[PDB]
Design a binder for these strands. Structure first.
Ligand SMILES: [K+]
Ligand SMILES: [K+]
Ligand SMILES: [K+]
Ligand SMILES: [K+]
Ligand SMILES: [K+]
Ligand SMILES: [K+]
Ligand SMILES: [Mg+2]
Ligand SMILES: [Mg+2]
Ligand SMILES: [Mg+2]
Ligand SMILES: [Mg+2]
Ligand SMILES: [Mg+2]
Ligand SMILES: [Mg+2]
Ligand SMILES: [Mg+2]
Ligand SMILES: [Mg+2]
Ligand SMILES: [Mg+2]
Ligand SMILES: [Mg+2]
Ligand SMILES: [Mg+2]
Ligand SMILES: [Mg+2]
Ligand SMILES: [Mg+2]
Ligand SMILES: [Mg+2]
Ligand SMILES: [Mg+2]
Ligand SMILES: [Mg+2]
Ligand SMILES: [Mg+2]
Ligand SMILES: [Mg+2]
Ligand SMILES: [Mg+2]
Ligand SMILES: [Mg+2]
Ligand SMILES: [Mg+2]
Ligand SMILES: [Mg+2]
Ligand SMILES: [Mg+2]
Ligand SMILES: [Mg+2]
Ligand SMILES: [Mg+2]
Ligand SMILES: [Mg+2]
Ligand SMILES: [Mg+2]
Ligand SMILES: [Mg+2]
Ligand SMILES: [Mg+2]
Ligand SMILES: [Mg+2]
Ligand SMILES: [Mg+2]
Ligand SMILES: [Mg+2]
Ligand SMILES: [Mg+2]
Ligand SMILES: [Mg+2]
Ligand SMILES: [Mg+2]
Ligand SMILES: [Mg+2]
Ligand SMILES: [Mg+2]
Ligand SMILES: [Mg+2]
Ligand SMILES: [Mg+2]
Ligand SMILES: [Mg+2]
Ligand SMILES: [Mg+2]
Ligand SMILES: [Mg+2]
Ligand SMILES: [Mg+2]
Ligand SMILES: [Mg+2]
Ligand code: NA
Ligand code: NA
Lengths: 401, 151, 221
RNA sequence: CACUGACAGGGAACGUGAGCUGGGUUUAGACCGUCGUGAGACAGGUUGGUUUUACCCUACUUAGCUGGAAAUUGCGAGAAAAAGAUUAUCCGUGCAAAGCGGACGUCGGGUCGUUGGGCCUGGCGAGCGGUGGGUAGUACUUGGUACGCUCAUCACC
RNA sequence: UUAAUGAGAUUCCCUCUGUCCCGAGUUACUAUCUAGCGAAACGACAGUCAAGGGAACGGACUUGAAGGGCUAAGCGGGGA
RNA sequence: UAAGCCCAAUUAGUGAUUGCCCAUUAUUCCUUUGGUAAGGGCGGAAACAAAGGAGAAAGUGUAGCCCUUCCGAUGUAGAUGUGGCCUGGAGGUUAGGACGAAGCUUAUGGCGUGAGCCUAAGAUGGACCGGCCUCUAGUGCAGAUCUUGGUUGGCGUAGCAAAGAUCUAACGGAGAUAUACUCAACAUGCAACGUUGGAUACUGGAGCGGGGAAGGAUUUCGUGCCAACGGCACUCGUA
RNA sequence: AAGUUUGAAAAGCACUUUGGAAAGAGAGUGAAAUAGAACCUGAAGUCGUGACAAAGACAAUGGAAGUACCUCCAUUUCAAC
């Protein structure tokens, strides 16, 4: 007989199976549609999640109750060291899908990029790309590279560059990995020849995050969510908890199916892996693209807040540390923990909404300690509050004596 | 009185043990892994299994036993560290080595050519179940025979 | 597909030349789906190696909407408790033809699967089949002899592109390029063909006369 | 009774008890009414009244290892490849064009055999390069790479 | 009819609360992995489905659809 | 331009009346078996050494006297027949066995439609026993929630989770610090026992404290001892 | 419940060697030691091992007809045959 009352089913069947992601890096399954009238450009970038904070800004949304009013917005800080372009790949359209025509490698590859080809680099022979480097600049090698580029020009419809992260630039102590993360970044805009020209110019060169993205634009984020291991139906799917009197346990689904069909269906909630799934999140507004702290110290200083401070809160980001490189401040949250590498992608949805076209101007960035209830924005304010302490006085006595 | 005959008797050494009192299945797994090994490599393997740096691969008697990363060297996923079987097999290997030395052979050149673990006659005990039931609580000893030949 | 290094080393040791098995290439353009499928299935069971091209140009009798609805009714069939391992609904025209032939075969025996693996189906004519020899048709399964011309008919590619096939435009562009290239190559070699025709014409006079009379007897000169 | 856009109707062994619960029905105790001489009866009312087992196989959920196109074998040779002394005898560009633009050489020698024969190898030089040293001035997120000249070797030779 | 008494049946009220809205976090012992030890129940043969007929609800049969092999932890839809 | 429906046909206004596929059916051939079976032969025709042959029984039934000729052969319950098979004994009669009897084993062949029989080989066994006629019966197993004994997948699985707990050094013990080469040690002898000293904890006098009854009956004590038992362990023990 | 039914005879395995012992490896008695002690024979079932046959998933088994490979088996031929 029919179920007595109606409620929506628990969970989304389009995110099945709830298995662990094959990779730990966010990888863009698709890229934004290619527009041949636009200038050639890069469509993605790799960043590392540092932590979260919140900002204050005045809203410019006419017709809203917060129009010309200040709101507090939680934001995510993502460290964005420059990426290095080491290869070019071309794709040809076939009636069975895109097939990569070939690869053009840069003449010189970083040690970090070549570490990606080893499980134990420091005890290896470190011979990666050695034969290729010898062959590339000979007559036959130059001919082969020209031939591959000509094949790209004639047959390719998609041009992607091979880029890797720079973990030496990301001088992070909690990021343990030293082998660079490698990903393909599609080149959109212009003709195939213009894409080839841009990719050739970018070869063996750094790409900064502000070249790919601009402030107040939105972006897509590809990342893997935080892992939780095996979980029950209550947390994995959101099913209700059974009454207290239930024999053999109440954190269960009471009926996992009818008598017929005489088997469990794939639509029934079961225990299993929860978290560590790849997710593509849409319309993350870019509130700030900050420069490196070594170049511009006052990262978190606004026009409305003249306090000279960096984007790193007091005591550092918990479990991550300080942000030493360029960073992106995304509105809201992104899937994954701190230290996980993530892919910012140019948006694939239309960007014509009043919220997606709003110009963001920050008025305050919180840099108080994320350990405990932080109440000082800078160390200077804390010293103003406390004055000289016993340790400082002992220090000054040791100095003057 | 072995199931198999050595290729060259004068170059081989035999060792046997009956009613070992170790578990037959664990000993079956432990002794089978050294078949075809040099004697010294088998003894190193047993020492490293005692140290828990290498495992005994469990085949045919691995029903719902745990998975380990140390079974990968054997092409398996389930292995254990059965110390009683390991020490019993170490004693048996020492006896075979003593026989080889007394015959005049070189213990560093011997290769284990035959291992056979068979179930011995069982020993009977009891366990007490609910509702006044008495139920068998049995022990499964094993026979182990081996010979190794000089190469 | 990619040969093993063992196979290449053995071929080098044997030193034998390039070998191509006897394969019939069928141009399935303007062919009735079921009749071509039946003929091809029988020929596969008889041991023939068949490659079929331009499967997007197969024909089904009836309006395109009726056949779209038939395919969508086919797509409704799924294992409810697990759609994975349920019926697999292939949307490409070549896959549709392969499925039709497979349904006309004893697919659950070694003999039937041997027959099925002997069939290669393409949309359009790919480069590895363009220059392999003259393509054949099936006279008893051709549209101009099977359908009364008044009645509407469906082109398989048009139906497939609306039931989920993604490569309609890719196949169209590839076929445009292929026909342009083949037309260029056929406008060329015209001098060669005319030269051979005139060579035969002049040979008709340069050869001994009783041979010419023999050719005239059998309708050759 | 009250919200709501609406509070549609049904099936799945009258879905679903080794999923629960056990209020009801339907044991044994007991009370009432009626019936019966009685023991007792009542699809009449009332109160109290043990809810056992998965470690097997499938299904489902996740989680690992691993071969395989003659779906393990045949040696049983099919490219969503190139386009040529039958892919062999160079490389680009051009439309499977017309044409066009480029290729390191010298002097021997140690074998197998139309054509300035094929294969291998020595002596000199020449180049495009790799790997190090010496020395500039730059570029790049600024410790690490590259680029200019000059030696050293090494590979194509 | 009845004060008092009741592990007796019932209704309401104050207080109080994770009974619930609506679940979350933490602990010990398990499960889980290992060493040693080591059973039982059950066991025709065996175990992917749809529909058909059929002793009128098939794992075997017909016609189709699936199905590479072997494993660990769970689970209670089926094994009437 | 059916591979649908209704009519027609058999290579097509050409010259006559069988397109093709499939049965345990029909026809025919071979073989078996049984008849309400039908007949022939059976008084050895004559001749014939080794260095054409063999048989020929007056018969229900056999390896059926022999030959020829017809007809029928499925079948639950059930009946009957069988010079039909098999088992333990008894009268007889023929054999066999230490140069290997019964039992047991089999890719071990042969014969029989079959029940079965016989041979071969045991790198099996070590002392009985086979064939035929008759007599006799505690005379043939796949299943009875069959009886007894053994084995077995489940399965190294469920589990061995109440009563808070053990640590450390030394001594004892075979129970270790146990290694082929390369070699400082860790990455190759682990884990586990008893006693003593320290430490830590629990019982908390309605005690895992001292004594008795009932019940038990040597469990008491010392020495030795570790096969089995104390569901892990033991060098300890109410063994 | 249970034949102590080893062997003709205890001739019941001295001695060497490894092992703490149990035992093992040799040696020895015996016609036999898978006749080594509650030991004549030693079945079936189940299990171990070496060698070989292969083999997807059609549960397996099964019939009929072939074929590939093997065969410590049975016959028949090897010359005016
Ligand atoms: K219901
Ligand atoms: K119910
Ligand atoms: K039915
Ligand atoms: K049915
Ligand atoms: K047996
Ligand atoms: K066969
Ligand atoms: Mg409803
Ligand atoms: Mg619903
Ligand atoms: Mg975590
Ligand atoms: Mg309960
Ligand atoms: Mg905090
Ligand atoms: Mg378990
Ligand atoms: Mg397990
Ligand atoms: Mg118990
Ligand atoms: Mg009791
Ligand atoms: Mg109903
Ligand atoms: Mg119901
Ligand atoms: Mg149920
Ligand atoms: Mg229940
Ligand atoms: Mg009740
Ligand atoms: Mg009365
Ligand atoms: Mg009641
Ligand atoms: Mg009652
Ligand atoms: Mg009372
Ligand atoms: Mg009371
Ligand atoms: Mg469990
Ligand atoms: Mg364990
Ligand atoms: Mg079904
Ligand atoms: Mg069933
Ligand atoms: Mg169930
Ligand atoms: Mg009968
Ligand atoms: Mg008798
Ligand atoms: Mg056999
Ligand atoms: Mg009887
Ligand atoms: Mg029997
Ligand atoms: Mg078992
Ligand atoms: Mg367990
Ligand atoms: Mg435990
Ligand atoms: Mg328990
Ligand atoms: Mg406890
Ligand atoms: Mg130790
Ligand atoms: Mg205390
Ligand atoms: Mg206490
Ligand atoms: Mg206390
Ligand atoms: Mg007391
Ligand atoms: Mg014990
Ligand atoms: Mg008896
Ligand atoms: Mg002797
Ligand atoms: Mg014997
Ligand atoms: Mg015996
Ligand atoms: Na026509
Ligand atoms: Na065997």
């Amino acid at each position: 007989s029919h179920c007595k009352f109606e409620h929506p089913r628990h969970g989304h069947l389009g995110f099945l199976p709830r298995k662990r992601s094959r990779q730990i890096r966010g990888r863009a399954r698709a890229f934004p549609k290619d527009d041949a009238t636009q200038k050639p450009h890069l469509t993605s970038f790799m960043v590392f999640k540092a932590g979260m904070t919140h900002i204050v800004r005045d809203v410019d949304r006419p017709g809203s109750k917060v129009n010309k009013k200040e709101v507090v917005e939680p934001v995510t800080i993502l460290e964005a060291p420059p990426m290095v372009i080491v290869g070019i790949v071309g794709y040809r359209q076939t009636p069975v899908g895109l097939k990569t025509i070939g690869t053009v490698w840069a003449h010189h590859t970083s040690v970090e990029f070549r570490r990606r080809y080893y499980k134990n680099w420091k005890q290896s022979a470190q011979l990666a790309f050695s034969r290729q480097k010898q062959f590339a600049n000979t007559k036959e090698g130059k001919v082969a590279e020209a031939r591959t580029l000509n094949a790209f020009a004639k047959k390719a419809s998609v041009i992607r560059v091979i880029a890797h992260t720079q973990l030496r630039k990301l001088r992070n102590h909690r990021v343990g990995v030293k082998k660079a993360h490698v990903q393909e970044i599609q080149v959109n805009g212009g003709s195939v020849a213009a894409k080839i020209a841009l990719a050739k110019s970018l070869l063996e060169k750094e790409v900064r995050v502000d070249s790919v993205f601009q402030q107040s634009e939105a972006c897509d984020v590809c990342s893997v969510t935080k892992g939780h291991g095996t979980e029950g139906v209550v947390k994995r799917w959101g099913v209700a908890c059974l009454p207290r009197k239930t024999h053999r346990g109440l954190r269960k689904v009471a009926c996992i199916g009818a008598w017929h069909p005489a088997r469990v269906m794939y639509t029934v909630a079961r225990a299993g892996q929860h978290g560590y799934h790849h997710r593509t999140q849409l319309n993350k507004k870019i509130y700030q693209i900050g420069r490196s702290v070594a170049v511009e110290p006052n990262q978190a200083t606004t026009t409305y807040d003249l306090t000279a401070k960096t984007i790193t809160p007091m005591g550092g980001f918990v479990g991550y540390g300080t942000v030493r490189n360029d960073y992106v401040m995304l509105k809201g949250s992104v899937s994954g923990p701190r230290r996980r590498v993530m892919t910012l992608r140019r948006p694939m949805a239309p960007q014509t909404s009043r919220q997606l076209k709003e110009k963001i101007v920050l008025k305050f960035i919180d840099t108080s300690s994320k350990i405990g209830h932080g109440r000082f924005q800078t160390k200077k304010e804390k010293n103003q509050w406390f004055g000289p302490l016993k340790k400082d006085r002992i220090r000054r006595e040791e100095r003057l004596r | 009185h072995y199931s198999r005959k050595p290729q060259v008797s004068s170059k081989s050494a035999k060792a046997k043990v009956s009613d070992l009192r170790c578990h037959y299945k664990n000993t079956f797994e432990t002794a089978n892994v050294i078949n075809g090994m040099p004697l010294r490599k088998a003894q190193q393997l047993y020492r490293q299994v005692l140290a828990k740096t290498r495992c005994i691969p469990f085949k045919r008697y691995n029903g719902k036993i745990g998975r380990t990363a140390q079974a990968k060297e054997w092409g398996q996923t389930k292995g254990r560290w059965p110390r009683k079987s390991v020490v019993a097999m170490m004693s048996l290997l020492k006896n075979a080595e003593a026989n080889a030395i007394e015959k005049g052979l070189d213990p560093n050149q011997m290769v284990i050519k035959h291992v056979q673990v068979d179930q011995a006659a069982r020993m009977r005990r009891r366990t007490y179940r609910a509702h006044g039931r008495i139920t068998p609580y049995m022990c499964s000893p094993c026979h182990v025979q081996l010979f190794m030949s000089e190469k | 597909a990619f040969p093993s290094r063992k196979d290449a080393f053995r071929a080098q040791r044997k030193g034998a030349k390039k070998h191509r098995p006897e394969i019939i290439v069928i141009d399935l353009k303007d062919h009735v789906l079921g009749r071509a499928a039946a003929v091809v299935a029988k020929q596969l069971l008889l041991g023939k190696k068949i490659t079929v091209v331009r499967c997007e140009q197969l024909n089904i009798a009836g309006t395109e909407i009726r056949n779209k609805i038939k395919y969508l009714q086919y797509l409704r069939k799924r294992k409810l408790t697990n759609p994975t391992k349920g019926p697999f609904h292939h949307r490409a025209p070549s896959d549709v033809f392969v499925r039709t032939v497979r349904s006309m075969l004893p697919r659950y025996t070694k003999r039937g699967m041997k027959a099925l693996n002997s069939l290669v189906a393409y949309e359009g004519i790919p480069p590895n089949v363009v220059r392999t020899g003259g393509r054949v048709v099936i006279p008893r399964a051709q549209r101009h002899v099977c359908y009364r011309s008044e009645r509407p008919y469906t082109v398989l590619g048009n139906m497939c592109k609306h039931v989920g096939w993604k490569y309609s435009d890719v196949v169209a562009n590839l076929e445009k390029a292929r026909v342009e290239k083949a037309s260029r190559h056929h406008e060329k070699q015209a001098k060669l063909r005319d030269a051979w025709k005139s060579a035969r014409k002049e040979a008709l006079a340069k050869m001994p006369k009783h041979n010419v009379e023999v050719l005239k007897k059998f309708g050759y000169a």
